[PDB]
């Protein structure tokens with residue numbers, strides 16, 4: 001019996017018990033998320049404890065079969081997935097402490113509140129007291145109060161914990177034979193191509209820096225335009241040749257500049273493309289929304305939704321007296337059970353969310369044939385990218401014109417294109433520098449380039465340089481501003497959004513070239529294109545059975561992450577921005593601050 | 597010489613085959629312990645089946661589904677078991693996979709067809725019906741019609757697990773994981789007097805004339821004449837030196853009839 005033979009037997013037994021425990025854990029999770037109760041949460045925990053214990057025990061045994069002696073890539077990739085994790089290295093005291101540190105950081109973030117100076121009894125929690133201020137408030141001092149208060153009550157409390165969190169997380173990663181925690185996070189993009197050298201985590205860092213250098217001109221012009229609009233909004237507080245204050249970015253952390261669209265709108269006279277009123281007028285409901293999504297997916301040749309999907313999914317909020325989690329989520333419970341738990345309402349936003357979530361169920365109904373371990377998107381970004389490409393294809397004015405949701409009399413002139421592209425940039429281009437800078441800061445903190453004695457100093461220097469944003473008030477090492485974000489306080493990676501945007505636009509350009517679409521890349525619909533659907537289904541079917549580089553080469557023709565499709569998508573926006581930035585200043589100075 | 601008449605003969609059988617006791621059984625066995633029922637000495641009415649649109653799969657190899665009611669077999673074997681929806685595909689000659697390696701098999705020259713239909717409403721519960729088992733691994737692939745009923749344990753890594761595994765049939769599972777009841781019919785070729793035949797009625801014998809004859813499934817055109825050849829009790833057909841069927845035994849009258857071509861020599865039409 002070869003090592004491969006024993007590996008196949010072990011993996012078969014693993015898939016058998018794994019499909020059994022996962023489905024049951026997914027059933028318990030569905031019951032709790034659809035019926036809120038102490039009894040349900042008890043069941044979910046029991047199902048999850050059983051699944052976690054089984055996964056750890058199987059991961060320990062999987063290390064008995066060296067990946068070298070393995071020949072078949074499929075078996076080798078399954079063994080790599082099992083051997084990478086499923087066995088903590090921290091001591092019992094350190095493991096308990098890490099758990100306590102993580103739980104405390106989550107608790108402080110959830111219960112974090114900022115109380116007013118004049119009235120200590122009046123207090124606002126992040127949801128939605130503080131978030132509403134950052135999202136809608138235009139009072140410089142009110143946003144400054146909310147921003148500085150959130151930092152003071154949350155960052156300072158998480159500062160001592162986050163420092164200890166880094167020490168423990170890096171130690172666990174070292175026990176997994178990695179350089180640091182950031183290196184452990186980058187292991188997703190590492191591949192082993194058989195035709196030569198493949199992809200490495202250092203290659204991921206090189207690619208993200210090079211892609212940022214390529215986006216910088218478009219981002220620089222968008223930053224200049226937003227700076228001029230903010231000078232119109234907030235006088236006597238913005239420097240024409242300087243960075244933008246952090247508390248004036250329409251958000252607690254300024255991850256997305258979407259909330260600044262009312263102030264930065266290119267042409268206010270031209271309206272948006274909202275079809276909520278037309279959806280309500282024609283008597284649309286959640287059933288019709290998901291049926292039209294199914295019609296869109298079946299036009300390109302993807303399979304129809306299963307009857308179990310229509311009979312077991314929560315497409316509306318229950319009214320019998322059952323508390324539910326209202327956050328949209330596409331579910332892959334296992335055993336061919338695909339459902340969506342979403343509070344569908346009659347709006348354009350819920351329509352696109354239905355298409356995005358159904359884009360998740362369409363990638364899962366393909367990799368289903370793959371083994372359980374390889375039932376996942378090629379990388380953290382490929383999946384979300386697939387959903388976003390679907391949303392981009394269905395949101396075009398032409399597609400809404402076919403559905404009857406958009407009046408045929410609507411005319412797509414240049415001003416509407418500029419408005420739509422600026423909104424897409426605010427939600428997409430305005431996020432890439434923030435995500436890249438935050439992940440670079442976390443990587444440098446984990447590696448050891450930035451000691452704790454310089455965490456806030458570097459964080460504010462990196463923010464000023466990469467993002468062009470300055471702190472409204474000086475911050476000492478008692479602050480942990482990064483930890484004020486949910487992803488940082490709850491231990492989640494962040495480069496996935498960056499790679500998701502890049503892969504999404506690469507897929508969009510590839511499928512639009514296949515669909516024989518001639519014209520701007522932002523007016524492209526892959527509907528009624530069996531060739532584009534065929535190549536998309538070929539992309540979705542492999543799952544994690546092959547290197548994501550090959551998958552990317554198969555679909556877009558190149559094996560390297562490229563921001564070229566992204567720049568071509570925003571090319572009209574780049575031209576219009578360059579036209580508007582002749583008299584303005586492009587770039588920023590990292591010396592000016594609002595408090596000096 | 598066009599045939600002026602058709603001669604169809606069947607043995608005197610009146611009992612109807614008990615197909616209902618198999619396709620409508622209250623309990624079905626697992627794949628590793630599939631149940632075989634021998635069918636003989638009865639008339640096979642296949643209209644009880646094909647007419648039903650319940651069957652998801654009905655694939656006959658070596659025989660025609662539409663011509664099943666016109667054929668005769670020595671014995672028919674009814675095998676019944678329950679598998680998954682995506683696994684019904686492995687019930688076919690020449691196919692390899694978990695079913696066709698350690699718990700069932702059909703030979704390359706298999707003659708007969710498998711009937712499969714969805715049984716979720718009977719074999720799938722909300723909490724999961726775990727009364728059906730399957731065998732992940734056996735030491736060697738199994739001869740075609742072998743049954744493994746032993747409860748033995750096999751080794752994965754350093755852990756001793758059981759060869760048999762629960763199927764896990766849920767009512768919320770996809771059709772690829774839903775339970776399917778599979779029933780097959782194995783047809784034994786004519787080496788003895790036919791015992792299973794269609795519901796057709798025997799016709800009157802016509803001798804010394806070019807007619808179309810159908811003796812227990814043997815269809816052809818020729819002139820039937822009295823034969824001096826003496827057939828054994830287990831013999832139904834006779835072959836000449838050229839391996840051509842020249843004599844056939846009448847199933848109804850137990851007599852031997854010679855088969856001759858309707859024309860002798862080259863014939864030219866002006």
Ligand SMILES: *[C@@H]1O[C@H](CO)[C@@H](O[C@@H]2O[C@H](CO)[C@@H](O)[C@H](O)[C@H]2NC(C)=O)[C@H](O)[C@H]1NC(C)=O
Nearest residue numbers: 016017020021024723724725726761762763764
């Ligand atoms: C999957 O998990 C379920 C958990 O209930 C297992 O179901 C039990 O299986 C044992 C096996 O002998 C039965 O005795 C129990 O009665 C079953 N439970 C119930 C509630 O009926 C099942 O065995 C597991 N399947 C696999 C593949 O291991």
